[PDB]
Design a protein around this ligand. Structure first.
Ligand SMILES: *[C@@H]1O[C@H](CO)[C@@H](O[C@@H]2O[C@H](CO)[C@@H](O)[C@H](O)[C@H]2NC(C)=O)[C@H](O)[C@H]1NC(C)=O
Ligand SMILES: *[C@@H]1O[C@H](CO)[C@@H](O[C@@H]2O[C@H](CO)[C@@H](O)[C@H](O)[C@H]2NC(C)=O)[C@H](O)[C@H]1NC(C)=O
Ligand SMILES: *[C@@H]1O[C@H](CO)[C@@H](O[C@@H]2O[C@H](CO)[C@@H](O)[C@H](O)[C@H]2NC(C)=O)[C@H](O)[C@H]1NC(C)=O
Ligand SMILES: *[C@@H]1O[C@H](CO)[C@@H](O[C@@H]2O[C@H](CO)[C@@H](O)[C@H](O)[C@H]2NC(C)=O)[C@H](O)[C@H]1NC(C)=O
Ligand SMILES: *[C@@H]1O[C@H](CO)[C@@H](O[C@@H]2O[C@H](CO)[C@@H](O)[C@H](O)[C@H]2NC(C)=O)[C@H](O)[C@H]1NC(C)=O
Ligand SMILES: *[C@@H]1O[C@H](CO)[C@@H](O[C@@H]2O[C@H](CO)[C@@H](O)[C@H](O)[C@H]2NC(C)=O)[C@H](O)[C@H]1NC(C)=O
Ligand code: NAG
Lengths: 167, 597
């Protein structure tokens, strides 16, 4: 647990760290935890995924939602069993002149399947004339980046999310 | 993949990149405006030119989607607001020449000077010192010297430049299928293809001309009153059947009549409502003001301030070396960052400018969810109207005596409210004829109905016929009087100041009617009522995504601008004026002139 809850750096949304883990009371009396509304409960082994997203997107990590995160980046099934927690990291994950080392994807050809991870980096093709691996007209590069800065309103700041799964 | 999915996909990437670059540029401009140096100028111009280049490239790129196939509305609105060729449709030489004459006109207006006729080494600029004589002096000869000399020594340098600014602008606008520059300007109030809320670029003229015909019965009476009062401070210079000489009107152009209040005050023995002493006697600092403003705004149902607004804002004047720009504004830096820049004192005018600017900020906060290109008022006149109704409502005794600045006793008489209404009319009504007439002149000049050897003739004919103001010295065709105004020589549209004055009172009446008000309209305060807040938010949260003729109906109940709320506002003053001009001659004749004898 100690590793992915307080580490020095977190992972980006299109490629999230995954841990198949081989004490719950301590996580509570801690950092503000701006949301702790889980579902499965009021096991053999557990997985613990984590990533960094925007503020006003945290309401999309949930069963049966829609957005550029729950369609191309991270989707939960309708019978979700683990839970989710999310909190603020505005002071540890932002810097003047932008923190361009966090990425997310906003173009894809088919919506994600539950519990899937997409690392591919092919040039997206919107038009009908094929692109053949070079940007330009109707062919884009699908990985943009948050420009995290400290002088953002709550909702555009970086938030760290950690999902625990059950089985 | 038809034609529309491609436009949508392209708009996504545009939104992302534009949001980022815009935040950077606006942060640079803020950091320069609050702390002036020599490196911040460069740190601002760098981002400014980068943003302009990005926008130009994206506009050139967005021309490949034929507008006549997009079937949605918001997609079409964005693509159309992005495809605007603007300037640069001209050749290179013409674009460079237009930029050069624009710069030369702005420089001439800014740094021109006129000096005394008996000591020519004692000149004085326009801003600190010329329009201080016009607004304070009570000498006929001094005001006449100032008025004549400004127009004769600066207006005569702007004519040969204006004569070709007109040609170049007309040609640029004709190269965009617009038929003249005036049509390009009116092309902001246009709605096309909504089946019930249409509006042509040619109906704005008709609607302005038809709603101005119902203001004349009040403007004529205010005119007669101001004239019969000026005839006691400059005896034997005004004629009781003629116009008003153009140099006796309070400022260099006569745009506002608000400096004549010390001369034409109805009841001069009753002091006006002015809370500056009771604010100092309670140690009201530069931060209790904004707290009370936020309290007023959250009372009706609107949100709080973002808590990033309190820390980053520059509310007071800074320390020893932090030279800034002390002009109150509201900044919308983007990405959820809203700020206020003003150097507040402990007075009463700042207590109202606080509410004005926070109204601007509330409008900016309401529609921050729309796409990038659709973040603005519904047209040119909505933002300032929304900002102004708050200052209108927060300056009434029924609100001051509940904040805590006035004694709970001290009921007000009727003479005090006539004083208040007359001071309001001297700056609200006394500026509608001027605005309408100047914009009519510019439209007729651009259209081609006034040949370039009849500009001053028509200008002074219309001034005598519409505004009721005669010139004190004949002006031949070598002058250019309109270009001696900021908006004319700096290429700014001017019709917004006329539609704003109507939207503002329509909003105020529709909001006071939902708060269940009973008295006259000039006593209403929308505070402490939730229905008014909801009715205002249901239009604030729209932005430019809907045609303005629908946003106006969401609040008021009509589709076009009306004028009945304004006269309903001024009714008591109207009755008093109609009973104070029994002996005078209501109206004016266009033949008398101060030199005809
Ligand atoms: C989260 O991790 C941090 C370090 O990554 C822990 O910080 C340490 O806390 C202990 C006890 O408070 C101190 O003795 C150490 O000096 C701290 N380390 C540093 C570098 O300051 C923290 O305890 C962890 N908290 C939880 C709940 O896991
Ligand atoms: C206002 O601007 C001035 C100059 O543009 C800033 O002064 C310098 O700021 C840099 C920024 O890191 C410092 O390293 C220098 O030591 C400052 N020098 C002096 C003489 O002040 C100033 O910091 C700016 N204001 C604020 C609040 O940062
Ligand atoms: C194209 O038009 C449709 C309707 O004409 C828009 O559909 C709306 O989309 C928003 C955004 O998801 C929804 O909240 C609304 O509920 C939709 N309306 C309806 C009636 O379903 C669509 O947004 C338009 N295209 C774009 C890019 O905005
Ligand atoms: C906007 O300006 C351009 C020129 O800068 C006009 O001309 C077209 O530009 C496109 C650019 O790719 C060319 O492909 C066309 O051949 C040009 N000529 C046309 C379309 O007749 C363009 O027409 C202007 N459009 C608007 C709406 O003003
Ligand atoms: C303000 O109110 C006073 C209070 O009545 C008005 O005074 C009246 O004026 C009329 C004029 O026709 C007289 O007939 C009444 O006798 C007056 N009242 C009293 C009690 O003597 C005054 O006219 C009002 N002023 C304005 C500008 O409306
Ligand atoms: C808005 O209404 C509230 C409550 O109805 C007013 O607040 C109270 O007003 C009563 C009546 O004077 C006072 O006795 C209380 O002390 C007030 N409470 C507070 C916390 O101030 C409030 O004054 C009204 N606001 C306006 C602008 O009229
Ligand atoms: C506004 O702020 C005050 C305290 O500053 C708080 O009590 C109030 O609940 C806030 N209003 C809203 C709508 O959150």
């Amino acid at each position: 647990f100690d590793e992915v809850f307080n580490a020095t750096r977190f992972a980006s949304v299109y490629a999230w760290n995954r841990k198949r883990i081989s004490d719950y009371s301590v996580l509570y009396n801690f950092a503000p935890f701006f949301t702790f509304k889980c579902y499965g409960v009021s096991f053999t082994n557990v997985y613990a995924d984590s990533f960094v997203i925007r503020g006003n997107e945290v309401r999309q990590i949930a069963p049966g939602q829609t957005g550029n995160i729950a369609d191309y980046n991270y989707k939960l099934p309708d019978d979700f069993t683990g839970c989710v927690i999310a909190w603020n990291s505005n002071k540890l994950d932002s810097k003047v002149s932008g923190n361009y080392n966090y990425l997310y994807r906003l173009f894809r050809k088919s919506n994600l399947k539950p519990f899937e991870r997409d690392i591919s980096t092919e040039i997206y093709q919107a038009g009908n004339k094929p692109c053949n691996g070079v940007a330009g007209f109707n062919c884009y590069f699908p990985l943009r980046s948050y420009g995290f800065r400290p002088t953002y309103g709550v909702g555009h700041q970086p938030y760290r999310v950690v999902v625990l799964s059950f089985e | 993949s038809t034609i529309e999915e491609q436009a949508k996909t392209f708009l996504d990437k545009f939104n992302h990149e534009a949001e980022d670059l815009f935040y950077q540029s606006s942060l640079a401009s803020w950091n320069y405006n609050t702390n002036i140096t020599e490196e911040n100028v460069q740190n601002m111009n760098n981002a400014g030119d980068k943003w302009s280049a990005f926008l130009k490239e994206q506009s050139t790129l967005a021309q490949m989607y034929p507008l006549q196939e997009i079937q949605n509305l918001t997609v079409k609105l964005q693509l159309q607001a992005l495809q605007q060729n603007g300037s640069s449709v001209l050749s290179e030489d013409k674009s460079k020449r237009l930029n050069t004459i624009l710069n030369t006109m702005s420089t001439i207006y800014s740094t021109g000077k006129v000096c005394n006729p008996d000591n020519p080494q004692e000149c004085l600029l326009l801003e600190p010192g010329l329009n201080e004589i016009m607004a304070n002096s009570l000498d006929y000869n001094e005001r006449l010297w100032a008025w004549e000399s400004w127009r004769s020594e600066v207006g005569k340098q702007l004519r040969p430049l204006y004569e070709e600014y007109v040609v170049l602008k007309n040609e640029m606008a004709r190269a965009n299928h617009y038929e003249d520059y005036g049509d390009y300007w009116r092309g902001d109030y246009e709605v096309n293809g909504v089946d019930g809320y249409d509006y042509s670029r040619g109906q704005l003229i008709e609607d302005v001309e038809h709603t101005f015909e119902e203001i004349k019965p009040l403007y004529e009476h205010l005119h007669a009153y101001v004239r019969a009062k000026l005839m006691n401070a400059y005896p034997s210079y005004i004629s009781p059947i003629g116009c008003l000489p153009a140099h006796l009107l309070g400022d260099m152009w006569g745009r506002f009549w608000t400096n004549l209040y010390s001369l034409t005050v109805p009841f001069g023995q009753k002091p006006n409502i002015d809370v500056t002493d009771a604010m100092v006697d309670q140690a009201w600092d530069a931060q209790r003001i904004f707290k009370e403003a936020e309290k007023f705004f959250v009372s009706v149902g609107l949100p709080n301030m973002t808590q990033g607004f309190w820390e980053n804002s520059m509310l007071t004047d800074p320390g020893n070396v932090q030279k800034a720009v002390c002009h109150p504004t509201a900044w919308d830096l983007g990405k959820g960052d809203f700020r206020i820049l003003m150097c507040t004192k402990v007075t009463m005018d700042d207590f109202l400018t606080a509410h004005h600017e926070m109204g601007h900020i509330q409008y900016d906060m309401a529609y921050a969810a729309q796409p990038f290109l659709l973040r603005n008022g519904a047209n040119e006149g909505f933002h300032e109207a929304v900002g102004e109704i708050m200052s209108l409502s927060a300056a009434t005794p029924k609100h001051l005596k509940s904040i805590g600045l006035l004694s709970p006793d001290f009921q007000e008489d009727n003479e005090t409210e006539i004083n208040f209404l007359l001071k309001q009319a001297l700056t609200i009504v006394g500026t509608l004829p001027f605005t309408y007439m100047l914009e009519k002149w510019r439209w007729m000049v651009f259209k081609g109905e006034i040949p370039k050897d009849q500009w001053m003739k028509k200008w002074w004919e219309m001034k005598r016929e519409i505004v009721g103001v005669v010139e004190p010295v004949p002006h031949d065709e070598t002058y250019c009087d309109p270009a001696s105004l900021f908006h004319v020589s700096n290429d700014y549209s001017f019709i917004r100041y006329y539609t704003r004055t109507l939207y503002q009172f329509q909003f105020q009446e529709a909001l006071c009617q939902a708060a269940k008000h009973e008295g006259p309209l000039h006593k209403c305060d929308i505070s402490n009522s939730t229905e008014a807040g909801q009715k205002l938010f249901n239009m604030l949260r729209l932005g430019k995504s809907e045609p303005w003729t629908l946003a106006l109906e969401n609040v008021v109940g009509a589709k076009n601008m009306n004028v009945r709320p304004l006269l309903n506002y001024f009714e008591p003053l109207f009755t008093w004026l109609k009973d104070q001009n029994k002996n005078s001659f209501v109206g004016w004749s266009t033949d008398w002139s101060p030199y005809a004898d």
